[PDB]
Design a binder for this molecule. Structure first.
Ligand SMILES: [Zn+2]
Ligand SMILES: [Zn+2]
Lengths: 334, 201, 200, 328
């Protein structure tokens, strides 16, 4: 019959009330800065479209990250620039500090704030029950902000969350897949990262919304409290849903595609089988138990839902018991 | 023609100037060099185109030891000569001609150079080139000048020259090399980093 | 093949053989159509696909390859190929004495063609030098870029040579020249080369 | 053979000294730290030396470095012993330090910095009183070294350094200086053409301190008459001719007679017959304010062929030409 339409429960009509220049990114005239302000230090990594260096702003001796672009997808670069300038100064959103170009070559570069990303990437170190609650609360701050500004991130994953552990500061980065939410709009389902794809993307439902980020978050939480990285480990996109179905159950899944009149790729029928919805207690062991609590599991469970509409919104999540101790401290520190 | 004109005319010997005979005849100018070369007398006589000593002694093929002694002696005389005002004027002439080659640094804009020894003791270092502009020392580009002893030009020839003729000092270079990557300059914090990663390695 | 012959020619020792793998993917060749005339017929001569035009097309193919080279040698593969030549000293050796014949890297002072010829970068002293061999005095600097060697050491920091062990110490009868004495010297040269009166 | 001569003053001063004083070959040189000094500019050049304005980087003081070119080891040890012997005597140059190059091994001498007045400057500036004052100052130095048994043997305008602002004087360059021992024959290739005394030109080897006085006479003549150099010979042989044209041939032949001096046949043909000219020929509108009866009288008593009849340094200081000076 055609799939059943869907709309975001929160901030649904924010973009329609806005003036055009807010969401019309392909009309955005770029304001160029001065490249002499910045000097390269070391190479951070390489891409297909970009060269990325750690640089240094000589005007104030502050570290920056230069991202040199080879000017492909006129849209996708302008989309990202518009988004970052709209999301400027928001809680835990990365600051786009400047944009510039080479006088001769004309090859542009984006200048972001540097974040002293401290991976417990083998001090063999780690966090705590509280660290997880604290950082999860920080992520929600940015997501509730960007959703309120009418923008969905579409690429929430550990890699896109920068932590300077010592200074306790967190930033959400890479808004190259971020997009404006317009109700009724049918969006690309080839976003995310396999392990962090929501079921909407995996079964090809295109009228999704901010709640896509919420599933992505829930995936990150399960990863952290269960100490399994990543939590849902599919070998492809098809096996990705299988890995979810062995946890969340097939019954709620079939109910989901029924509800929205989605048509499954025939391929899933053979490989999906029929699985019970497992109790989260099955993943607890001597090495992760100190991170799993009835509050964590309750909060987790209200994120990871097949039905995108039944997920918690970013603001709702912030009001869960899981965050009480964190909210109290946030309050006490003024 | 003379031995000096012959020597100064050989391939590889372009850096040398032809030393005046009157300077060489005067014993005062050669004080102490007699204890620096073997076969001193016969060597000096060879340089001054005078009849050689006898036959039946080239048991060490003694012609060859005298020929090499005469070569070494001429350089050592040359070393003192070019410190004198006259020697300076002869070399300055060659310098204006560019006979010593030009500076390889790009931002020196082909400043004519002067020969110089890193050492005054023979056999230790070959002849090098001093650019008065950038004030650094370089290896001659041709391998023909790679077998001339630096002790023959001396440690302080160019230093003398500009102290006697300061008029000839070129202005220190106007521009300097500025490394750019995609327009961006390179910080200097970034060599300090680069230099470890090679050590740490 | 055209690539192997061009890089094997007299004067083109600095060039590396660009993988056809890279040239067939037209992603990499962006904007180059607005930089060289006869772009389509010049690109054809490179992948081996009337004495008026056939002469000009050969020159336009030489200018295309060179510009492509400038991009290619910034890539990890293009870096590795030049790095191989660098380890065999294909780029000449540093004329500075206290660099002790450090192997060099090609570099362009400018990125736009016709403005400057190719020069040599020394990783030790970090200055640029004119190629000692006068067979390289006709290679356009734009074909190697301003950024090649700097990119190289960013990707392979291990390859930075340690700062010069020693330094040039000018000595006159073994007394060093005080720097008070160049400041003087530099005037006497200014004050000297002064406009000689031009008789009415 | 040629008739023997002694010095009429300070004759046996060296012979009853301890040998440490006059045996310069035996002298071991105190070496200094070369790294103290760096060269600023070239100042002058001799036949044995190169001179530089330097700076002592330990204390930032301005200094002078006289670099000695390759000579015998004798001559260098002699200059140094003499400079040490004469250290701190009136108007004698103070040796501040001796250094050596380690590799080159070419020795160099360091001095306190002299603010010498340009040589041409003070030939324009010196007054009648000035010449008298500075002549007296040179005499204090010449009398001191002669008392201490050393002849300078290279007295000339360039070896006398005048700081005319601070009115103070210094006799330099003791590279040709020598110890005086009675009855010894010395080298005659000393001095400088225009300042060599007749005993050097006629090849009389048994000379003494009085050689300096002749040199001093030539200096006086040059200054008061404003003609430099006064006796301007083209070579060693013409030098005696230029003198013979002023002092006459008569006194000169009487002199080679007195001492059984053998002339080089070379002279005969170019020496000839010359009257003893009155000094008034050399006096014109431009030099007259410097020439007086006392100046001429003093000059005449210095410029004598007979070395034994020239005024000793001590006697010279008593001449009426200085009377106006001595009171101060
Ligand atoms: Zn230079
Ligand atoms: Zn170098």
């Amino acid at each position: 019959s055609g799939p059943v339409p869907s709309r975001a429960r929160v901030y649904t009509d924010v973009n329609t009330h806005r003036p055009r220049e807010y969401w019309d990114y392909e009309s955005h005239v770029v304001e160029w800065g001065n490249q002499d302000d910045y000097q390269l230090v070391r190479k951070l990594g390489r891409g297909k479209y970009s060269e990325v260096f750690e640089a240094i702003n000589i005007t104030n001796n502050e570290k920056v990250v230069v991202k040199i672009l080879k000017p492909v997808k006129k849209k996708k670069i302008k989309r990202e620039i518009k988004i970052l300038e709209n999301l400027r100064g928001g809680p835990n959103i990365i600051t786009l500090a400047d944009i510039v170009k080479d006088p001769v070559s004309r090859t542009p570069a984006l200048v972001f704030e540097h974040v002293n990303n401290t991976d417990f990437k083998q001090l063999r170190q780690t966090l705590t029950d509280y660290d997880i609650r604290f950082y999860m609360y920080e992520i929600l701050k940015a997501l509730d902000y960007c959703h309120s500004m009418g923008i969905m991130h579409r690429d929430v994953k550990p890699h896109n969350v920068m932590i300077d552990h010592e200074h306790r500061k967190l930033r959400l980065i890479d808004w190259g897949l971020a997009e404006f939410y317009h109700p009724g709009q049918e969006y690309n389902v080839r976003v995310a990262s396999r392990y962090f794809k929501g079921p909407e993307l995996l079964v090809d439902y295109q009228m999704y919304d901010y709640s896509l980020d919420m599933w992505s978050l829930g995936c990150m939480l399960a990863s952290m409290i269960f100490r399994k990285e990543p939590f849902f480990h599919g070998h492809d996109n098809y096996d990705q849903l299988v890995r979810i179905a062995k946890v969340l159950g097939t019954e709620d899944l079939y109910d989901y595609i029924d509800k929205y009149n989605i048509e499954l790729d025939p391929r899933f029928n053979d490989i999906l089988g029929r699985h019970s919805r497992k109790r989260w207690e099955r993943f607890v062991h001597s090495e992760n138990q100190h991170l799993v609590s009835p509050e964590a599991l309750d909060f987790l469970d209200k994120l990871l839902r097949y039905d995108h509409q039944s997920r918690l919104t970013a603001r709702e999540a912030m009001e869960h018991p899981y965050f009480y101790t964190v909210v109290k401290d946030q309050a006490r520190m003024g | 023609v003379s031995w000096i004109s012959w020597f100064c005319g050989l391939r590889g010997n372009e850096f040398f100037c032809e030393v005046d005979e009157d300077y060489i005849q005067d014993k005062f100018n050669l004080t102490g060099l007699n204890e620096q070369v073997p076969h001193y007398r016969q060597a000096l006589d060879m340089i001054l185109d005078l009849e050689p000593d006898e036959e039946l002694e080239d048991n060490p093929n003694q012609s060859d030891l005298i020929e090499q002694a005469a070569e070494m002696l001429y350089g050592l005389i040359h070393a003192r000569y070019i410190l004198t005002n006259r020697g300076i004027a002869q070399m300055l002439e060659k310098y204006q001609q560019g006979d010593f080659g030009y500076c390889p640094r790009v931002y020196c804009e082909n400043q004519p150079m002067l020969p110089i020894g890193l050492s005054d003791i023979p056999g230790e270092a070959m002849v090098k080139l001093y650019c008065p502009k950038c004030m650094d020392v370089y290896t001659p580009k041709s391998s023909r000048h790679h077998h001339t002893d630096g002790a023959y030009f001396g440690t302080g020839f160019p230093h003398m020259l500009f102290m006697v003729h300061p008029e000839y000092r070129p202005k220190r270079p106007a521009n300097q090399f500025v490394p750019r990557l995609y327009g961006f300059k390179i910080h200097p914090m970034a060599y300090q980093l680069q230099l470890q990663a090679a050590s740490n390695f």
